Symmetry: D2
Subunit: 287 residues, 4 copies
């Protein structure tokens, strides 16, 4: 009977931007995939189609490029400028969500202006503004890692649907997806990103895994213990199964050497590791 | 300082199941992509690698196939059985999230056991159990629609970054992604899905759009006004731009006939249409 | 020592075009993904970077849109116009390859100007011109089909690496990728495409399969025998494995009802079915 | 007319294999995606469904894993072993096509058994056997490169549909897809692949480009001039457009700094650079 407009947001998604810094002959590249969405009083736009408050998504797009001209120190700094502009430049806009994927490039043999894409990982940044409050979540994704040994899985319950054999030596492969929330905007974003990445990789490799859950816990612990500016880190790790192929039918044995890497299904272990006392239901995780 | 394990879940994702009903010569096909994740007391698994509480993801997978053998009337009913099994079958498992994508098949010339895939839309379902509470969200995605006319966009604010021209005749194209939450388990799931789908399509097609936000609002309103078992519907609609090509440089006009369908960027309009007074932020939307 | 420039072609790939026919209130939609590439004397362009002979890819793109303005009866007709234009408009351009994917749309409840995408298949067309000769290849792809029974596979040889068990009842699922070459440009392209599509589906469903190879042969035979204008048809059919899950570990039998649909690996059966006495290696197949 | 079975092949595609070398504590990882297809007398299999000659695709898959157990120096030598096995093991199998993609892994902090994927490129290998002839084509794909300056495009003809403006400074970005055919199987496959990769990257970066065609020719020439064992190299290079955004409407200039990286359409430049006198159309290119 009675319908009500609830949470809503709109903007331009996936604006691909490449910013070349060329004041000197030593060029620099910043490659981003930017998304901008605004929140506020858009009631009339939905109920009546009145666009008085609707800053065109095309305009949001143009702004991204116009602002890039001035350059930016980091992806987070760029998003902060965009969010401030939209929330303060329009009275009916009270907040929003600005996000970006950053793609890395490497110089070709140290060339001044020739590069090749480093596709081994994608960096992410998300900024959410709510009234006078703002929060930033940085992250990494697409980083595939694997341990050929030093992984075990045993001691799990065995019901009538259990057939998995316990093992003290298996491959542990996953795609590192992690996002962490800063408790302050005054951060050396690039330095922390590189640090976290290294801590996650180190924790994954050096931890004698008794379960993906434990490896993940150790990865998150390393981050929280190293960075006071991070209140929590969320990780989503798939267990990309590498099955030890049965070679007995061919008169052979398989001493943990030949594996079939299955696409699906895959285990999916996810968890939030946080600083004792910190918030557990921050709105930025709602998207 | 003190590190703590927060929210967490784990299970098997993307178990591809195809259930053939062949008690009669008239075969039926059910094609699903199932994901099962458990929630409960998994503290020791994360902090010590103690897997006593860890029902193997492989076991969760086995359960999916064993349960499918008995058959299921609908995807939602299937997920309901899985959820009750894990929560009730293990004391330390207090809840979870079970989801599925349903893929449609049509018979080949009404053949008894020959079919072709209908890839024009994917049906989804998600069940979340939290203690004694159960919540179900059904949805539809991948349904691309387009109106060649009957779409306008004007009256939006113009700042120094606005270059978009107002229009009273443009193409409106989007991919319908919609999710709605049920307020009861006693629903004719298949019948409601077919109805919601038709209402969304009907509203999109019949509404003289003054904005994508308005079209979306009308789509949601129709669903809520029609089904008492639905408390809210969320939609994420991309505005897939079809640019009217300028052929004037060649001395040709273009009366809304020739368009360039750009990939990215795209407008992204999202909103929640709720039954007045219903829950504001149900946990199921968090994931 | 001595390096020579061999075969070469260039142009604009994937020009997304949507042509709306709206002379009457009953709108029509033609949605294409067009690729244009030219062949001829481009020696200097490659060896010296002299672009006198290089019709810009941007120009080829503009030409696609300019020509679309006049409309076109079929995709093949449209490609024929483009091919003729480039080969006759430039003396150094002696031929080329023009291709297109055609996407289908259905009216939403028979509405005059509102449609939804039919993603169950994609139609293709390729025109190749070489001097005074030209050839057209039409095709279909992305059409997934499945037989729940009426498929067998036994009688295959066994060696030390063979573990496969014979069967007289299995699921036969594949993706229909087929391409046929016309022996003349005087063809009712839309009618033949529809007919061919129907012949492939009919043969797939009605042939009691003893092998995917056999089914494929029957599909090709039906097409060649029905259409005089077709000299040969090439097919690439993956055998998408649907494994009958073993439920005995759970105390249940599985009377051909519960299957695991594996992504990879997959059988890949390919063959060319030809009209006796036709060309055996037409250049259009090289691409 | 009669219907005839023309060219045909069948086998198992995309068999994902991971081979771990672990004789010492210093583990090595070989990651491949293997495809096996046989050629020969399969007439009966197609026309009568007689599978006496049909070595099961499942058997081919098993053979890949069994052979993997013995280890292999390079991907090409692995394919050679497989190819010789099937052709020499079955009288009716006269040849075939074996291919593989090789995925790279780097150690995490020089760890003995912990690695991360290098996704910046994918190495490929294709072997075709025809009687006693063994033809091998190695290649690289997915390697995206970009030059921020040192690229021009002018002097092209301006026909009635040309709007592109001449320029002496633009971004040149592409995805390096190259394949080269060896004229002998006695090659240091890993060394040549590394050399070729370096030569392509070098030519791309150091060539002052007047056209993508020129940059490509120079890349191919460098390879042929350096490797006697290579008879020809084919390249397929997309011109991934990075449009210099017009910020003048916002009162700003854009000195080659802010770009929009478009997805489609894109220029597609392709060519074959051969050693003078070598085979014009080796059958392996048909696939």
């Amino acid at each position: 009977t009675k319908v009500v407009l609830g949470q809503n947001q709109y903007g331009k998604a996936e604006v691909r931007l490449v910013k070349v810094t060329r004041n000197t002959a030593r060029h620099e590249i910043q490659d981003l995939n930017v998304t901008s969405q605004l929140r506020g009083d858009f009631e009339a736009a939905h109920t009546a189609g009145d666009n008085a408050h609707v800053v065109a998504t095309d305009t949001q797009k143009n702004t991204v490029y116009a602002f890039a001209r001035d350059g930016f120190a980091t992806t987070e700094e760029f998003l902060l400028r965009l969010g401030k502009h939209f929330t303060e430049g329009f009275d009916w806009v009270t907040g929003g969500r600005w996000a970006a994927q950053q793609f890395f490039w490497d110089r070709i043999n140290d060339h001044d202006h020739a590069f090749s894409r480093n596709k081994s990982e994608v960096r992410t940044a998300v900024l959410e503004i709510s009234g006078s409050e703002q929060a930033i979540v940085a992250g990494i994704e697409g980083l595939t890692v694997l341990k050929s040994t030093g992984s075990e899985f045993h001691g799990f319950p065995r019901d009538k649907y259990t057939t998995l054999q316990e093992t003290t030596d298996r491959i542990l492969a996953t795609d590192v997806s992690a996002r962490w929330r800063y408790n302050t905007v005054e951060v050396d974003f690039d330095a922390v990103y590189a640090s976290v990445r290294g801590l996650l990789l180190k924790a994954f490799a050096e931890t004698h895994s008794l379960a993906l859950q434990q490896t993940m816990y150790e990865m998150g612990r390393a981050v929280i213990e190293t960075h006071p500016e991070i209140d929590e880190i969320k990780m989503s790790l798939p267990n990309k199964h590498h099955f030890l192929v049965d070679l007995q039918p061919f008169g052979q044995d398989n001493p943990n050497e030949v594996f079939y890497a299955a696409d699906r299904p895959y285990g999916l272990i996810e968890a939030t590791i946080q600083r004792e006392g910190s918030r557990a239901d921050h709105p930025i995780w709602s998207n």
